[PDB]
Amino acid sequence: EQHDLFSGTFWQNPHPAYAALRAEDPVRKLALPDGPVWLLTRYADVREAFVDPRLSKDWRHTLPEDQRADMPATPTPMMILMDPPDHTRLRKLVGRSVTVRRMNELEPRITEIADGLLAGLPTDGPVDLMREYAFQIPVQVICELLGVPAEDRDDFSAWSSVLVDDSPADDKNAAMGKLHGYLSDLLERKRTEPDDALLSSLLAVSDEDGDRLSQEELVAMAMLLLIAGHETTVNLIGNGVLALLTHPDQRKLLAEDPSLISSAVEEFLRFDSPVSQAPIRFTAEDVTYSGVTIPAGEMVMLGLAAANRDADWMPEPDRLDITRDASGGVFFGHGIHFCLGAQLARLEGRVAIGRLFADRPELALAVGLDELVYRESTLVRGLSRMPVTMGPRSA
Ligand code: HEM
């Protein structure tokens, strides 16, 4: 029987729609508002697709060859929108800065941010755990990462939380512009007053040939990190928290053994992937997956949330099991575009989710599951609000 796709019942719980697709319709054209897209839902296909060089990040493949004689490769100089060789250079340059130790140095501050939020939350409801906890953490973390001055945090938080869908892309189009101007100004200041944070680190990146990020490249990279790192992490927190609130057995296991948190975070990423579909790829030529040919010039979405529950990859994929091993999940992508922030996202997930459940052992949903309202956003598995009762702080 025909499950709604990206409409009606899908938004509250897409997983049965995904399971029916994997089984009976694994390469499926679906009509979306701005354009039709092809959806690949099987694990092996999604994984193959991520390394398929015929699947490009360049939108100009939607144009006939003689009509590309006008258009730029990219709307903004953003690495995620590029193929090699241009991607390879930008990835190389940002990877000089985004280091293992840099990500870890942030851990005490992530803990601080999370503890401060938890302390200001009331015991008796209702509280929206999204607006009040989940929404707040990742941008304050990005602020720490980048070296946004403390005076500017609240302002920067205001402007970026606009990007996380509230009103139409008119004042968001202007929020982008203000963020762009602000960061461009900041990069200026960092050049003469260097510090230990990411923006000044990126400015000085100078490879073996003298190559470096241009002023425009720097600003687009900064904006990318913000956009890639905010909403995604927010929904990791929300979805991971929900997973524990809806599985008392798994929450018990975490409570008894807090060190399971790292394993739990991988399992929440698998079980209810916050980036539900990868950003759109474009067919540079015809491709065939599961006997279905997608013609050249089409838009293709890799179903990460579907692939992560594919029984041909993970046995008992509909069971939540925090002791399980993550190995092979596609929630952070695969191949050349693999999430640049995956270590930080994982760190923020474990801190945010682990400290929450430590501080509030009696945390509970304040509505039924059938009353939860999900964002209607193609690429996102994200709660718009999560009503909860926090309960007493642990002694
Ligand atoms: C739970 C949170 C996160 C999830 C689920 C996630 C997921 C992903 C996925 C699936 C991709 C691949 C896109 C593609 O192949 O088309 C990606 C790329 C990226 N992510 Fe994340 N991400 C998260 C957090 C972050 C954070 C915190 C940052 C930065 C601090 C970040 C920065 C990026 C960047 C820069 C790319 C582009 C990589 C490239 O094009 O070479 N992400 N992410």
Residues 185, 218 contacting (CB under 8 angstroms): no
Q: Given its phi and psi angles, is residue 140 left (phi above 0), alpha (psi -120 to 50 degrees) or beta?
A: alpha
Ligand 1, residue 98: give the atom nearest the CA: 30
- Count of other CB atoms within 10 angstroms of residue 249: 9
Residues 289 and 48: beta-carbon distance below 8 Å: yes
> 355 with 87: CB under 8 angstroms?
no
To what resolution in angstroms was this structure determined? 2.0
Structure tokens at 55: 């699947």
Buried-exposed string 165-193: b where 16+ CB fall within 10 A, e elsewhere: beeeeeebeebbebbeebbeebbeebeee
**Method by which the model was determined:** X-ray
Residue with the two structure tokens 């008119």: 170
**What residues line ligand 1, using a CB cutoff of 6 Å?**
79-80, 91, 224-225, 228-229, 232-233, 236, 274-275, 278-279, 331-333, 337, 339-341, 344-345
CATH topology of domain 1-395: Cytochrome p450 (1.10.630)
Q: From 187, 177, 172, 193, select the one nearest 217 (Cα to Cα).
A: 187
Could you list the residues known to form a binding site, using ranges: 339
Bridge partners, 38 (sequence order): 29, 300
Q: How far apart are CA 136 and CA 114, in angstroms?
A: 9
Task: Give 186 Cα–ligand 1 centroid separation in angstroms.
Answer: 23
Ligand 1, atom 31, lies closest to the CA of 341
Give residue 194 CA to ligand 1 midpoint distance, Å: 27
Picking from 197, 211, 209, 152, the residue whose alpha carbon sits closest to that of residue 178 is: 152
Residue positions in the annotated binding site for heme? 339
**Helices of type H across the chain:** 15-24, 43-50, 86-95, 100-105, 107-119, 129, 136-146, 153-163, 172-192, 198-204, 215-245, 248-256, 261-271, 304-307, 342-359
Which residues, 6+ apart, have CB-to-CB distance to 229 below 8 Å? 138, 141, 142, 145, 341, 344, 345
- Give, as one character, the DSSP assignment of residue 209: T
Residue located nearest, by CA, to atom 27 of ligand 1: 229
CA of 250 from ligand 1 middle (Å) equals 27
Omega cis (within 30) before 126? yes
* Residue 148: C-alpha distances to residues 154, 186, 215, 326, 330 (Å): 10, 8, 17, 34, 31
Total residues found in the chain within this entry = 395
